[PDB]
């Protein structure tokens, strides 16, 4: 007679590929890159013959043989294809195989491929779109979000968006390398943690806690080997399979390695680090350069060199290469993209009508453009023109544009910038015909997070009623509310003047929009963004 059935032993069933260590702060000990997951299963055989071969089967195939030599068996076996799998024991004789019932098993990988869908109902003011107008609409998820400002990656209106970049993937270093990370209490502190035992120039996780250990929604399991943002993000790719995830290198404060890499030592390092990183988190789909910027006037006062236009270019083109191998060796497309200052002084530094044959958007950062760090000279800070008391005007959103064009990149290359915050001032005063940025200021706006800055989000929620003055300046195209018994002046981005900007990409022929923070948005701005560019009402 055939085997009796076996009963699969309880035990584990969940198994990872790409391991995390739970008890180590150091990148080089908390993750380990396997090229199969081991596995194991073990079983009893409470009634009839033991047969004389077990095998282990998933989803009906063989992963493992052996003879059956007792009531009792185990097997270890590798799986190397994340997933989950139908497995079962079965006990063979000459008269026939005998089956177990099935039981699940889990194997994790980095694509997500062992997760539901991460399908989470939109939230706050955002309406759906489908992305059909094919231009891109970004926006850059912060890291920190998590923790104050207690923004997930389930709370990103994933649907209205074809680009979600992820701020910011450190580069490693210590003294002289990072020391803009010196001025935010503990921060270089953790990255030297994160990079122990870790050479300089390489890649890393700023906060691991934040990106692969926090509990969030959906891993929430203690042994789901992917937690935090990028096991979310892993969730989110399985839920979205046509977003691309970039991770962002650099920002304000963890650029400074960048102007070292005219050293093709440090820049090999580093462009290696980079594929090692893609290939480790697999649903990232490229990377984004935001170099803060070449030339300096970033975060660090001493650091900025002639030399670093040219080590830009060399950059994104080494990075295209190692891309292009990357893409052939998976079948995958991926994208390199870079964030730009859009000060026509600080774009001609940079050749990027070179440069654009290695990119695929350049995300042009129309932001900023004026803040609290000046008190003197107040202006829009994120206007598309100049305004008429100030024609002018440098920075600009069309004249970042301009300067683009006129080097000879591509229209089609170039991603307009819109913020999700405003900046501002108190204390505005001594200003000529009711126009506030014809004064000047005592001090910042007090901030929603830190000083100068206000989400839009209470923008919206608290600074559109009581004293507050609005005005839309149609010249510039450009909101601002003003409290005049405090001088408090805020200069922001609303639904209307994203809507003249996604005019302007449509008439003008550029790649699109892109925002920074999302969590900041209450939903009109990415509404707007995905309005004004053409993208239908509804779902796909
Ligand atoms: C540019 C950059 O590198 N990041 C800055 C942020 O780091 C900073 O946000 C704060 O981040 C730290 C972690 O890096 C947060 O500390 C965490 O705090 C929670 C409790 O609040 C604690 O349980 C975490 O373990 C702890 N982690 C670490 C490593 O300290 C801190 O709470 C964040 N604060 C916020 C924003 O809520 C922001 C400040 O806005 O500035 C960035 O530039």
């Given at each position: 007679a055939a085997p009796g059935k076996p009963t699969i032993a309880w035990g584990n069933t969940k198994f990872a590929?790409?391991?995390?260590?739970?008890?180590?702060?150091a990148y080089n000990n908390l993750v380990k890159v396997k090229n199969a997951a081991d596995v194991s299963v073990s079983w009893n055989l409470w009634n009839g013959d033991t047969g004389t071969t077990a095998k282990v089967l998933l989803n009906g195939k063989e992963a493992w043989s052996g003879p059956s030599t007792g009531s009792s068996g185990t097997a270890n076996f590798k799986v190397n294809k994340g997933g989950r799998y139908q497995m079962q024991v079965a006990l063979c004789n000459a008269d026939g195989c005998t089956a177990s019932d099935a039981t699940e098993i889990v194997v994790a990988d980095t694509d997500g491929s062992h997760l539901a869908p991460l399908k989470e109902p939109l939230l706050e003011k955002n309406k759906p779109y489908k992305q059909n107008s094919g231009k891109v609409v970004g926006s850059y998820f912060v890291e920190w979000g998590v923790y104050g400002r207690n923004f997930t990656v389930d709370k990103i209106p994933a649907q209205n968006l074809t680009h979600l970049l992820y701020g910011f993937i450190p580069i490693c270093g210590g003294n002289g390398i990072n020391d803009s990370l010196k001025e935010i209490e503990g921060s270089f502190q953790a990255l030297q943690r994160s990079c122990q035992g870790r050479e300089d120039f390489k890649v890393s996780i700023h906060d691991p806690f934040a990106a692969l250990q926090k509990a969030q929604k959906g891993v929430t399991?203690?042994?789901?080997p992917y937690k935090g943002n990028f096991g979310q993000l892993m969730a989110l790719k399985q839920a979205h399979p046509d977003l691309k995830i970039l991770p962002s290198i650099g920002g304000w404060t963890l650029s400074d390695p960048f102007f070292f890499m005219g050293d093709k030592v440090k820049r090999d390092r580093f462009v290696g680090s980079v594929k090692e990183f893609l290939q480790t988190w697999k649903f990232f789909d490229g990377v984004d350069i935001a170099w803060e910027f070449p030339g300096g006037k970033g975060a660090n006062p001493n650091l900025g060199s002639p030399q670093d236009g040219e080590t830009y270019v060399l950059l994104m083109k080494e990075l295209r290469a190692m891309l292009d191998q990357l893409s052939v060796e998976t079948g995958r497309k991926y994208e390199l993209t870079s964030a730009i200052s859009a000060g026509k002084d600080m774009i001609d530094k940079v050749a990027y009508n070179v440069a654009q044959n290695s990119m695929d958007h350049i995300f042009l950062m129309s932001y900023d453009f004026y803040g609290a760090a000046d008190l003197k000279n107040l202006g829009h800070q994120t206007a598309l023109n100049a305004p008429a008391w100030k024609p002018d005007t440098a920075y600009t959103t069309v004249n970042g544009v301009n300067a683009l064009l006129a080097q000879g990149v591509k229209p089609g290359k170039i991603v307009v910038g819109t913020a999700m915050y405003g900046r501002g001032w108190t204390g505005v005063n001594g200003y000529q015909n009711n126009i506030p940025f014809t004064g000047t200021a005592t001090g910042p706006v007090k901030g929603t997070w830190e000083n100068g800055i206000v989400d839009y989000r209470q923008i919206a929620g608290?600074?559109?009623?009581?004293e507050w003055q609005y005005t839309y300046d149609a010249t510039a195209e450009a909101p601002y509310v003003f409290k005049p018994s405090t001088g408090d002046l805020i200069t922001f981005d609303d639904a209307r003047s994203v809507q003249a900007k996604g005019k302007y990409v449509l008439d003008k022929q550029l790649g699109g929009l892109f925002s920074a923070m999302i969590d900041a948005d209450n939903g009109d701005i990415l509404n707007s963004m995905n309005a004004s560019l053409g993208n239908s009402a509804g779902v796909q």
């Open positions: 590929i790409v391991e995390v260590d739970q008890a180590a702060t399991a203690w042994d789901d608290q600074f559109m009623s009581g």
